[PDB]
Amino acid sequence: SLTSADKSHVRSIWSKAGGSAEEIGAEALGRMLESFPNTKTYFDHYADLSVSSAQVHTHGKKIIDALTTAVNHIDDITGALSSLSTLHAQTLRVDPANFKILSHTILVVLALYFPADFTPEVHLACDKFLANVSHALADNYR
Amino acid sequence: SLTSADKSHVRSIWSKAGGSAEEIGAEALGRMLESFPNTKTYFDHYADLSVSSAQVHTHGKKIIDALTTAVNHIDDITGALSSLSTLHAQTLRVDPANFKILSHTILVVLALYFPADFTPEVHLACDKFLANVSHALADNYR
Amino acid sequence: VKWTDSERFAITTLWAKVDVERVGAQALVRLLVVYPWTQRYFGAFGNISDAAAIAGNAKVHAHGKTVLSSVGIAIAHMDDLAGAFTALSAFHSETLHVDPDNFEHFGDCLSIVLAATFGTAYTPDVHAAWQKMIAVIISALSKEYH
Amino acid sequence: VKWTDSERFAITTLWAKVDVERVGAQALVRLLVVYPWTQRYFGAFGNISDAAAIAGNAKVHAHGKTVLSSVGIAIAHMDDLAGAFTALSAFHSETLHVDPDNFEHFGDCLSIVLAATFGTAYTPDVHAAWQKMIAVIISALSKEYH
Numbered sequence: 326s327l328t329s330a331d332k333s334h335v336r337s338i339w340s341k342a343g344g345s346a347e348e349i350g351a352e353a354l355g356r357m358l359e360s361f362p363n364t365k366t367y368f369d370h371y372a373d374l375s376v377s378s379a380q381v382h383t384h385g386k387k388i389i390d391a392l393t394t395a396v397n398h399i400d401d402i403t404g405a406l407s408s409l410s411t412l413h414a415q416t417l418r419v420d421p422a423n424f425k426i427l428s429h430t431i432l433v434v435l436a437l438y439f440p441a442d443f444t445p446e447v448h449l450a451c452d453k454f455l456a457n458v459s460h461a462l463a464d465n466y467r
Numbered sequence: 468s469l470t471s472a473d474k475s476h477v478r479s480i481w482s483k484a485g486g487s488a489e490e491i492g493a494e495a496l497g498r499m500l501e502s503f504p505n506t507k508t509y510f511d512h513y514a515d516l517s518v519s520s521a522q523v524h525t526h527g528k529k530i531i532d533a534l535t536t537a538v539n540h541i542d543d544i545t546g547a548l549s550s551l552s553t554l555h556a557q558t559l560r561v562d563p564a565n566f567k568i569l570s571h572t573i574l575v576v577l578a579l580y581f582p583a584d585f586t587p588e589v590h591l592a593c594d595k596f597l598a599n600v601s602h603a604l605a606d607n608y609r
Numbered sequence: 610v611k612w613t614d615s616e617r618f619a620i621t622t623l624w625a626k627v628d629v630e631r632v633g634a635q636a637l638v639r640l641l642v643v644y645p646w647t648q649r650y651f652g653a654f655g656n657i658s659d660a661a662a663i664a665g666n667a668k669v670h671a672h673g674k675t676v677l678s679s680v681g682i683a684i685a686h687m688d689d690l691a692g693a694f695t696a697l698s699a700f701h702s703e704t705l706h707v708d709p710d711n712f713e714h715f716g717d718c719l720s721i722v723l724a725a726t727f728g729t730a731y732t733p734d735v736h737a738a739w740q741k742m743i744a745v746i747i748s749a750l751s752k753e754y755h
Numbered sequence: 756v757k758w759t760d761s762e763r764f765a766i767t768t769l770w771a772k773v774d775v776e777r778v779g780a781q782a783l784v785r786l787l788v789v790y791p792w793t794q795r796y797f798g799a800f801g802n803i804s805d806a807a808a809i810a811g812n813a814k815v816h817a818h819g820k821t822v823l824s825s826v827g828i829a830i831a832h833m834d835d836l837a838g839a840f841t842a843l844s845a846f847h848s849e850t851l852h853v854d855p856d857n858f859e860h861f862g863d864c865l866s867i868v869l870a871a872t873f874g875t876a877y878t879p880d881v882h883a884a885w886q887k888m889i890a891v892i893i894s895a896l897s898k899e900y901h
């Protein structure tokens with residue numbers, strides 16, 4: 326579970342980044358698609374998978390906004406994300422092995438854009454937080 | 468989370484096997500050590516790692532008894548196993564990647580000894596249940 | 610990979626008693642039930658959304674047998690499998706986009722089935738050799754990802 | 756592994772600006788803090804039980820630099836790494852018993868550090884090439900497990 330110190334660290338880095346939701350989310354999504362190309366089949370309906378893609382921008386903002394909501398309901402990530410879990414499991418049919426991939430590219434992007442804020446302990450906190458988010462999104466799969 | 472149908476299935480197969488705690492646990496531990504030999508360093512203090520080893524028998528019974536306790540407190544696996552989590556994390560220093568390995572050899576042994584009881588749905592239930600046990604044991608690691 | 614003679618023999622002898630139909634059906638059935646998101650990858654099979662439907666599905670049966678015959682082929686190429694499986698790897702990556710975590714789910718299902726099928730004949734040493742064989746298969750199928 | 760010229764160049768050019776000291780220390784620091792059970796494997800380093808102690812530890816620093824120089828060596832053998840790393844793989848398996856999941860924790864730390872170090876120069880394409888390089892390193896280090 327996230328400790329109080331973890332949640333402070335997550336709220337801190339997210340407060341610093343949430344204003345760039347679209348840019349951050351497009352970088353993270355874009356990077357998932359290019360660095361882990363087995364993910365591209367999920368977004369094969371988009372004409373452009375690049376960071377400048379308007380569809381990648383729109384969807385990237387959705388991802389970061391959903392995480393912001395989780396950060397604001399950090400004591401119950403399960404309830405915040407259970408609807409999205411159903412969606413990814415039943416409608417989108419996303420293999421849940423992919424959740425850690427987007428979690429990783431999110432961390433990369435946070436490092437890239439806020440290197441002084443993303444200290445080792447903040448990374449730890451943010452890694453626990455995205456594992457919790459991923460565990461939550463995986464919960465309805467079986 | 469485990470559904471009611473999952474918990475019935477777990478209690479069923481465990482009711483059928485719990486009487487053979489020692490034999491079952493020695494097979495599962497023995498098999499972990501031989502099939503996944505990167506685990507042997509954790510039990511390097513034992514003179515014999517074979518299924519007939521008296522130390523493997525004593526410890527195998529402990530493992531199966533701890534799982535039995537979890538099966539009997541199946542609505543709160545976290546509270547049942549938090550002490551063991553601390554122990555594996557702080558005292559034993561077991562890398563938590565190993566938890567899925569013993570989970571798998573437990574499933575193998577259940578299949579082997581109760582093939583007609585270990586139907587696909589029971590396997591599903593028991594796989595969810597041991598993932599939950601593993602997630603619980605991993606909880607105090609960071 | 611380097612094999613001991615005992616590993617070699619454990620594998621080929623067990624294999625000589627494997628019904629590739631029953632074992633292959635049962636392994637694939639378990640994959641589809643225990644890891645039900647893998648059902649996405651098998652759209653061609655029709656209704657595989659629940660356990661009784663998966664288990665009675667004749668296309669699940671035929672495909673399990675195909676997977677197990679390919680296992681047979683891996684055994685025949687057990688000294689050169691990375692190479693023998695190049696197309697099959699490439700096929701699972703580039704055409705199907707299977708996350709390779711699913712290869713070990715399948716391996717686990719297969720080992721579980723062999724235990725159920727063989728009982729006490731699936732001794733710890735024979736299990737260990739089969740886990741090594743499965744690990745080699747997994748590694749070969751995961752290779753043409755990079 | 757097959758490399759494009761663009762991948763080749765992305766890697767060697769980024770590498771020409773890497774401070775193996777600062778990047779190697781920071782990657783290892785992150786490994787020890789974010790995955791704190793890896794601390795068990797590094798008993799020789801003394802007190803590495805908390806973040807400020809890990810980060811100020813001169814043995815953590817020296818060892819991070821060693822890991823990054825080995826990364827340098829992988830780059831120099833990027834067409835034959837499975838082979839070049841055989842002893843190093845064998846060493847991590849048979850002497851140290853490192854679970855190979857930890858190789859990807861380390862890879863992730865390294866990519867994170869390169870992003871922090873390089874900022875916008877770590878473009879998606881350069882990140883993709885580096886992830887491929889890390890995946891090759893991981894695969895090479897995991898190989899002498901079977």
Ligand code: HEM
Pocket residue numbers: 364367368384387388389391392409413417419423424425426427428458459462
């Ligand atoms: C932190 C993890 C994740 C979060 C927070 C997240 C969030 C979301 C949200 C909020 C939507 C709905 C957007 C809308 O209403 O328009 C969505 C859709 C989607 N997600 Fe995710 N997701 C995550 C992981 C993944 C992964 C790993 C994949 C695939 C590799 C994936 C694939 C999709 C797809 C295909 C859609 C439909 C998007 C579209 O049609 O344009 N998601 N996700």
Ligand code: HEM
Pocket residue numbers: 506509510526529530531533534551555559561565566567568569570600601604
């Ligand atoms: C389902 C997962 C697991 C359960 C339920 C379990 C349970 C236990 C229990 C109850 C004990 C204490 C026994 C006593 O008081 O004498 C224990 C000790 C131990 N566990 Fe586990 N454990 C699990 C997984 C693992 C794994 C995966 C490893 C290593 C690969 C491991 C290594 C140990 C070791 C080294 C000890 C000390 C045993 C001794 O000193 O003889 N455990 N475990």
Ligand code: HEM
Pocket residue numbers: 647650651653654672675676679680697701705707711712713715716746747750
């Ligand atoms: C681990 C061992 C596995 C082996 C040995 C194996 C082998 C095979 C073979 C031999 C074929 C026939 C290919 C051809 O036509 O040339 C095949 C097809 C296929 N495999 Fe696998 N496979 C494995 C795991 C998986 C997993 C885990 C998935 C998905 C979760 C998967 C999905 C498929 C699909 C979708 C096809 C095409 C089936 C169709 O006809 O509709 N495989 N596989």
Ligand code: HEM
Pocket residue numbers: 793796797799800818821822825826843847851853857858859861862892893896
């Ligand atoms: C992923 C890339 C990694 C590389 C490239 C790497 C490379 C190296 C190298 C070059 C050495 C020096 C070996 C020698 O003396 O010949 C070494 C030592 C070592 N590595 Fe790694 N390693 C990696 C990951 C890991 C991980 C993840 C762990 C543990 C979690 C680990 C644990 C060790 C230990 C314990 C030593 C001995 C250190 C000592 O002097 O006390 N390594 N490694």
